[PDB]
Amino acid sequence: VLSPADKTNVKAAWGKVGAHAGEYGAEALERMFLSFPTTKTYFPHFDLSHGSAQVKGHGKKVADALTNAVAHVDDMPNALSALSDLHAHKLRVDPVNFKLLSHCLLVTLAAHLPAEFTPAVHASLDKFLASVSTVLTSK
Protein backbone atom coordinates (compact mmCIF):
# COMPACT_ATOMS: atom_id res chain seq x y z
CA VAL A 1 0.00 0.00 0.00
CA LEU A 2 1.10 3.56 -0.73
CA SER A 3 2.04 5.70 2.23
CA PRO A 4 1.19 9.41 2.48
CA ALA A 5 4.83 10.19 1.64
CA ASP A 6 4.65 7.88 -1.40
CA LYS A 7 1.63 9.78 -2.67
CA THR A 8 3.27 13.18 -2.17
CA ASN A 9 6.55 11.98 -3.70
CA VAL A 10 4.86 10.57 -6.79
CA LYS A 11 2.70 13.68 -7.25
CA ALA A 12 5.74 15.93 -6.88
CA ALA A 13 7.98 14.01 -9.26
CA TRP A 14 5.25 13.59 -11.88
CA GLY A 15 4.31 17.26 -11.52
CA LYS A 16 7.74 18.14 -12.91
CA VAL A 17 7.03 16.30 -16.18
CA GLY A 18 4.88 19.17 -17.48
CA ALA A 19 4.42 19.43 -21.23
CA HIS A 20 6.83 16.49 -21.61
CA ALA A 21 4.25 13.96 -20.35
CA GLY A 22 3.58 12.33 -23.73
CA GLU A 23 7.23 12.53 -24.74
CA TYR A 24 8.38 10.61 -21.65
CA GLY A 25 5.67 7.98 -22.09
CA ALA A 26 6.79 7.48 -25.68
CA GLU A 27 10.43 7.27 -24.59
CA ALA A 28 9.63 4.60 -21.98
CA LEU A 29 7.87 2.52 -24.63
CA GLU A 30 10.83 2.88 -26.97
CA ARG A 31 13.19 1.86 -24.14
CA MET A 32 11.04 -1.20 -23.50
CA PHE A 33 10.83 -2.27 -27.14
CA LEU A 34 14.63 -2.02 -27.60
CA SER A 35 15.63 -3.53 -24.23
CA PHE A 36 12.98 -6.27 -24.10
CA PRO A 37 12.15 -7.29 -27.68
CA THR A 38 9.49 -9.77 -26.58
CA THR A 39 7.20 -6.81 -25.89
CA LYS A 40 7.15 -5.74 -29.56
CA THR A 41 4.71 -8.42 -30.65
CA TYR A 42 1.79 -6.61 -28.96
CA PHE A 43 2.05 -3.84 -31.57
CA PRO A 44 2.09 -5.47 -35.04
CA HIS A 45 0.12 -2.49 -36.39
CA PHE A 46 2.64 0.04 -35.09
CA ASP A 47 5.99 0.85 -36.53
CA LEU A 48 8.29 0.79 -33.50
CA SER A 49 11.26 2.70 -34.97
CA HIS A 50 12.58 5.95 -33.52
CA GLY A 51 10.42 8.95 -34.32
CA SER A 52 7.38 6.75 -34.90
CA ALA A 53 4.23 8.87 -34.79
CA GLN A 54 2.42 5.81 -33.53
CA VAL A 55 4.73 5.33 -30.55
CA LYS A 56 4.52 9.09 -29.87
CA GLY A 57 0.73 9.02 -29.84
CA HIS A 58 0.68 5.92 -27.69
CA GLY A 59 3.12 7.43 -25.19
CA LYS A 60 0.61 10.22 -24.69
CA LYS A 61 -2.13 7.69 -23.91
CA VAL A 62 0.15 5.83 -21.48
CA ALA A 63 1.07 9.12 -19.79
CA ASP A 64 -2.61 10.12 -19.52
CA ALA A 65 -3.38 6.83 -17.78
CA LEU A 66 -0.51 7.33 -15.31
CA THR A 67 -1.69 10.90 -14.66
CA ASN A 68 -5.18 9.54 -14.00
CA ALA A 69 -3.67 7.09 -11.50
CA VAL A 70 -1.68 9.88 -9.80
CA ALA A 71 -4.78 12.08 -9.61
CA HIS A 72 -6.89 9.24 -8.19
CA VAL A 73 -4.20 7.44 -6.28
CA ASP A 74 -6.52 6.31 -3.47
CA ASP A 75 -9.07 4.96 -5.96
CA MET A 76 -6.85 3.36 -8.59
CA PRO A 77 -8.79 0.13 -9.12
CA ASN A 78 -11.81 2.26 -10.03
CA ALA A 79 -9.96 4.88 -12.09
CA LEU A 80 -8.16 2.25 -14.17
CA SER A 81 -11.02 -0.27 -14.47
CA ALA A 82 -11.53 0.16 -18.21
CA LEU A 83 -7.80 -0.09 -18.85
CA SER A 84 -7.58 -3.22 -16.70
CA ASP A 85 -10.27 -4.96 -18.72
CA LEU A 86 -8.53 -3.96 -21.95
CA HIS A 87 -5.07 -5.21 -20.95
CA ALA A 88 -6.35 -8.53 -19.56
CA HIS A 89 -9.45 -9.49 -21.61
CA LYS A 90 -8.73 -8.12 -25.08
CA LEU A 91 -4.95 -7.84 -25.24
CA ARG A 92 -3.89 -10.68 -22.93
CA VAL A 93 -0.78 -8.86 -21.77
CA ASP A 94 1.60 -11.13 -19.86
CA PRO A 95 1.98 -9.75 -16.31
CA VAL A 96 5.80 -9.85 -16.54
CA ASN A 97 5.62 -7.12 -19.14
CA PHE A 98 4.28 -4.58 -16.65
CA LYS A 99 7.49 -4.94 -14.64
CA LEU A 100 9.44 -4.26 -17.85
CA LEU A 101 7.53 -1.10 -18.71
CA SER A 102 7.60 0.09 -15.08
CA HIS A 103 11.39 -0.27 -15.06
CA CYS A 104 11.63 1.67 -18.32
CA LEU A 105 9.46 4.44 -16.88
CA LEU A 106 11.83 4.72 -13.90
CA VAL A 107 14.79 4.89 -16.27
CA THR A 108 13.07 7.59 -18.32
CA LEU A 109 12.34 9.67 -15.21
CA ALA A 110 15.88 9.23 -13.87
CA ALA A 111 17.29 10.32 -17.24
CA HIS A 112 15.19 13.50 -17.32
CA LEU A 113 14.59 14.55 -13.72
CA PRO A 114 17.82 13.98 -11.76
CA ALA A 115 16.81 16.34 -8.91
CA GLU A 116 13.53 14.47 -8.41
CA PHE A 117 14.96 10.94 -8.65
CA THR A 118 16.20 10.66 -5.07
CA PRO A 119 16.41 7.22 -3.43
CA ALA A 120 13.15 7.87 -1.49
CA VAL A 121 11.32 9.09 -4.58
CA HIS A 122 12.66 6.16 -6.64
CA ALA A 123 11.17 3.84 -3.98
CA SER A 124 7.84 5.68 -4.09
CA LEU A 125 7.69 5.62 -7.90
CA ASP A 126 8.48 1.91 -7.94
CA LYS A 127 5.69 1.20 -5.48
CA PHE A 128 3.30 3.39 -7.48
CA LEU A 129 4.09 1.69 -10.80
CA ALA A 130 3.78 -1.71 -9.12
CA SER A 131 0.33 -0.68 -7.81
CA VAL A 132 -0.71 0.49 -11.27
CA SER A 133 0.56 -2.84 -12.64
CA THR A 134 -1.42 -4.83 -10.07
CA VAL A 135 -4.61 -3.05 -11.13
CA LEU A 136 -3.88 -3.53 -14.84
CA THR A 137 -3.41 -7.30 -14.34
CA SER A 138 -6.33 -7.78 -11.94
CA LYS A 139 -8.97 -8.19 -14.60
Partner: protein
Amino acid sequence: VHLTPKEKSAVTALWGKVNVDEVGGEALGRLLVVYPWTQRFFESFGDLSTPDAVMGNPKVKAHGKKVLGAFSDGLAHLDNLKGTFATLSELHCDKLHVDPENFRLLGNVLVCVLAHHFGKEFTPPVQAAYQKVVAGVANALAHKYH
Protein backbone atom coordinates in the same frame (compact mmCIF):
# COMPACT_ATOMS: atom_id res chain seq x y z
CA VAL B 1 24.35 -12.89 -24.06
CA HIS B 2 25.64 -11.28 -27.25
CA LEU B 3 26.33 -7.58 -27.69
CA THR B 4 26.83 -6.17 -31.16
CA PRO B 5 30.04 -4.16 -31.69
CA LYS B 6 27.94 -0.97 -31.61
CA GLU B 7 26.55 -2.05 -28.24
CA LYS B 8 29.94 -3.10 -26.89
CA SER B 9 31.34 0.28 -27.94
CA ALA B 10 28.48 2.15 -26.29
CA VAL B 11 28.84 0.13 -23.07
CA THR B 12 32.62 0.45 -22.77
CA ALA B 13 32.58 4.18 -23.57
CA LEU B 14 30.01 4.93 -20.87
CA TRP B 15 31.69 2.70 -18.31
CA GLY B 16 34.96 4.57 -18.72
CA LYS B 17 33.14 7.63 -17.40
CA VAL B 18 31.58 5.89 -14.38
CA ASN B 19 32.71 7.06 -10.94
CA VAL B 20 33.98 3.74 -9.55
CA ASP B 21 34.01 5.03 -5.99
CA GLU B 22 30.35 6.04 -5.91
CA VAL B 23 28.13 4.31 -8.48
CA GLY B 24 28.20 0.89 -6.80
CA GLY B 25 27.29 2.29 -3.41
CA GLU B 26 24.42 4.23 -5.00
CA ALA B 27 23.09 1.09 -6.66
CA LEU B 28 23.43 -1.02 -3.51
CA GLY B 29 21.92 1.72 -1.33
CA ARG B 30 18.98 2.13 -3.69
CA LEU B 31 18.48 -1.65 -3.70
CA LEU B 32 18.23 -1.53 0.12
CA VAL B 33 15.82 1.43 0.05
CA VAL B 34 13.62 0.37 -2.86
CA TYR B 35 13.47 -3.36 -2.00
CA PRO B 36 13.75 -3.36 1.80
CA TRP B 37 13.72 -7.14 2.29
CA THR B 38 17.27 -7.05 0.92
CA GLN B 39 18.37 -5.43 4.20
CA ARG B 40 17.99 -8.88 5.80
CA PHE B 41 21.42 -9.68 4.36
CA PHE B 42 23.15 -6.57 5.73
CA GLU B 43 22.43 -6.59 9.47
CA SER B 44 26.10 -5.94 10.28
CA PHE B 45 26.16 -2.70 8.27
CA GLY B 46 24.60 -0.71 11.10
CA ASP B 47 22.30 2.25 10.43
CA LEU B 48 19.84 1.53 7.61
CA SER B 49 16.90 3.28 9.28
CA THR B 50 16.34 6.00 6.65
CA PRO B 51 17.23 6.49 2.99
CA ASP B 52 19.81 9.15 3.99
CA ALA B 53 21.35 6.79 6.54
CA VAL B 54 21.56 4.02 3.95
CA MET B 55 23.10 6.13 1.21
CA GLY B 56 25.61 7.76 3.56
CA ASN B 57 26.53 4.55 5.38
CA PRO B 58 30.27 4.01 4.90
CA LYS B 59 29.78 0.21 4.68
CA VAL B 60 27.16 0.54 1.94
CA LYS B 61 29.52 2.73 -0.08
CA ALA B 62 32.45 0.37 0.54
CA HIS B 63 30.49 -2.75 -0.29
CA GLY B 64 28.95 -1.11 -3.35
CA LYS B 65 32.48 -0.52 -4.63
CA LYS B 66 33.07 -4.29 -4.54
CA VAL B 67 29.81 -4.89 -6.42
CA LEU B 68 30.78 -2.45 -9.13
CA GLY B 69 34.17 -4.12 -9.43
CA ALA B 70 32.44 -7.38 -10.28
CA PHE B 71 30.36 -5.66 -12.96
CA SER B 72 33.59 -4.18 -14.31
CA ASP B 73 35.09 -7.67 -14.35
CA GLY B 74 31.99 -8.92 -16.16
CA LEU B 75 32.37 -6.14 -18.73
CA ALA B 76 35.87 -7.39 -19.52
CA HIS B 77 34.65 -10.95 -20.12
CA LEU B 78 31.29 -10.78 -21.91
CA ASP B 79 32.01 -14.19 -23.46
CA ASN B 80 32.74 -15.94 -20.15
CA LEU B 81 30.39 -14.55 -17.53
CA LYS B 82 30.02 -18.03 -16.01
CA GLY B 83 33.65 -18.58 -15.02
CA THR B 84 33.97 -14.94 -14.03
CA PHE B 85 31.14 -15.20 -11.52
CA ALA B 86 31.85 -18.78 -10.41
CA THR B 87 33.01 -18.10 -6.84
CA LEU B 88 30.46 -15.27 -6.44
CA SER B 89 27.73 -17.69 -7.48
CA GLU B 90 28.87 -20.19 -4.84
CA LEU B 91 28.81 -17.32 -2.32
CA HIS B 92 25.43 -15.84 -3.24
CA CYS B 93 23.60 -19.09 -3.96
CA ASP B 94 25.17 -21.80 -1.78
CA LYS B 95 26.26 -19.75 1.25
CA LEU B 96 23.95 -16.72 1.37
CA HIS B 97 20.86 -18.23 -0.26
CA VAL B 98 19.90 -14.95 -1.96
CA ASP B 99 16.93 -15.46 -4.27
CA PRO B 100 18.24 -14.92 -7.81
CA GLU B 101 15.37 -12.56 -8.64
CA ASN B 102 17.36 -10.08 -6.55
CA PHE B 103 20.30 -10.27 -8.97
CA ARG B 104 17.91 -9.08 -11.66
CA LEU B 105 16.67 -6.31 -9.36
CA LEU B 106 20.18 -5.07 -8.51
CA GLY B 107 21.13 -5.03 -12.19
CA ASN B 108 18.05 -2.97 -12.97
CA VAL B 109 18.82 -0.57 -10.09
CA LEU B 110 22.31 -0.16 -11.58
CA VAL B 111 20.66 0.71 -14.91
CA CYS B 112 18.56 3.38 -13.15
CA VAL B 113 21.71 4.78 -11.53
CA LEU B 114 23.48 4.95 -14.90
CA ALA B 115 20.45 6.77 -16.30
CA HIS B 116 20.49 9.13 -13.31
CA HIS B 117 24.17 9.97 -13.80
CA PHE B 118 24.32 10.14 -17.58
CA GLY B 119 20.92 11.62 -18.40
CA LYS B 120 20.30 12.06 -22.11
CA GLU B 121 23.56 10.23 -22.89
CA PHE B 122 21.90 7.09 -21.52
CA THR B 123 19.90 6.71 -24.73
CA PRO B 124 17.42 3.90 -25.37
CA PRO B 125 19.97 1.93 -27.47
CA VAL B 126 22.61 2.42 -24.76
CA GLN B 127 20.16 1.14 -22.16
CA ALA B 128 19.35 -1.88 -24.33
CA ALA B 129 23.05 -2.75 -24.45
CA TYR B 130 23.33 -2.43 -20.66
CA GLN B 131 20.24 -4.60 -20.19
CA LYS B 132 22.02 -7.40 -22.06
CA VAL B 133 24.97 -6.95 -19.71
CA VAL B 134 23.04 -6.95 -16.44
CA ALA B 135 20.94 -9.93 -17.57
CA GLY B 136 24.15 -11.77 -18.37
CA VAL B 137 25.63 -11.02 -14.94
CA ALA B 138 22.40 -12.04 -13.17
CA ASN B 139 22.23 -15.29 -15.11
CA ALA B 140 25.88 -16.14 -14.39
CA LEU B 141 25.56 -15.27 -10.70
CA ALA B 142 22.60 -17.64 -10.50
CA HIS B 143 24.44 -20.53 -12.17
CA LYS B 144 24.74 -22.50 -8.92
CA TYR B 145 20.92 -22.52 -8.79
CA HIS B 146 20.67 -24.14 -12.22
